[PDB]
Amino acid sequence: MASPLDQAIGLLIGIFHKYSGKEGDKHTLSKKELKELIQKELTIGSKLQDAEIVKLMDDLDRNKDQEVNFQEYITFLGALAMIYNEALKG
Amino acid sequence: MASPLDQAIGLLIGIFHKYSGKEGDKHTLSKKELKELIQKELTIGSKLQDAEIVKLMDDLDRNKDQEVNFQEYITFLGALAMIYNEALKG
């Protein structure tokens, strides 16, 4: 069955594809799409703590002139998650 | 605030913490916990596609006798996703 994990994975995939879809090689996307993704799909406004700020900055270096793939996109979210849910860093 | 992304991230976090919590250093967990995680939380049984099998195998070789962190767990999930959610490859 589409258990909570599979569903949540499904969400992260769907979120990816929502932008990556347009890039043709929709297994990848870049800087612009990443900034869009975070800014649009995280309706935060109040730039939480540091994590998201650092993601937005980092994005420029992380990409520079290269597309990122799915897992490297996920890493953006996982890093975000770790930095603001400080707990996860132990 | 807790937009679809944040919620879905929240799910993957929650899933991790549900077991990783018990390790105390809940940034990390290992082989046994990982197999438990996927087995329990993906209520599949009817092994959808190779991905899950390959994860279950891979886990042993990946861990050996070494813990994995949150992002590495997310890599396990992201790889599972990649392999069975065919779209992510093509």
Side-chain angles (χ1 to χ4, degrees), chain A residues 9-50:
Chain A
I9 289 171
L11 268 147
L12 271 60
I13 295 175
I15 292 283
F16 187 70
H17 197 323
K18 185 174 179 291
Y19 292 77
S20 316
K22 302 170 58 56
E23 308 302 300
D25 181 25
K26 60 203 80 182
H27 322 112
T28 64
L29 46 46
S30 67
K31 191 189 297 184
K32 179 86 289 314
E33 295 79 62
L34 292 162
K35 284 182 176 297
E36 274 174 281
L37 271 162
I38 201 173
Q39 181 185 112
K40 271 92 277 299
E41 282 64 41
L42 291 181
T43 64
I44 282 172
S46 56
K47 298 294 98 62
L48 294 176
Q49 174 236 46
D50 174 77

Side-chain angles (χ1 to χ4, degrees), chain B residues 24-90:
Chain B
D25 183 7
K26 63 187 181 178
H27 178 190
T28 56
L29 45 44
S30 316
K31 194 192 298 184
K32 189 61 58 55
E33 308 95 278
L34 291 161
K35 295 178 75 62
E36 263 58 277
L37 258 163
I38 194 175
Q39 180 171 224
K40 287 178 285 194
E41 300 302 311
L42 291 184
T43 65
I44 288 173
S46 306
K47 299 293 179 65
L48 300 178
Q49 186 257 52
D50 303 66
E52 189 181 353
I53 303 61
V54 174
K55 251 68 280 308
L56 288 162
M57 304 312 91
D58 170 71
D59 181 71
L60 282 66
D61 178 77
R62 185 172 194 206
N63 283 252
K64 310 182 177 58
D65 291 287
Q66 304 172 234
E67 314 96 288
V68 307
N69 99 310
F70 181 67
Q71 196 73 72
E72 291 173 292
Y73 144 85
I74 301 291
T75 309
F76 198 78
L77 299 187
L80 179 80
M82 191 180 298
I83 303 157
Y84 60 32
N85 302 108
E86 70 302 278
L88 292 172
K89 297 182 289 184

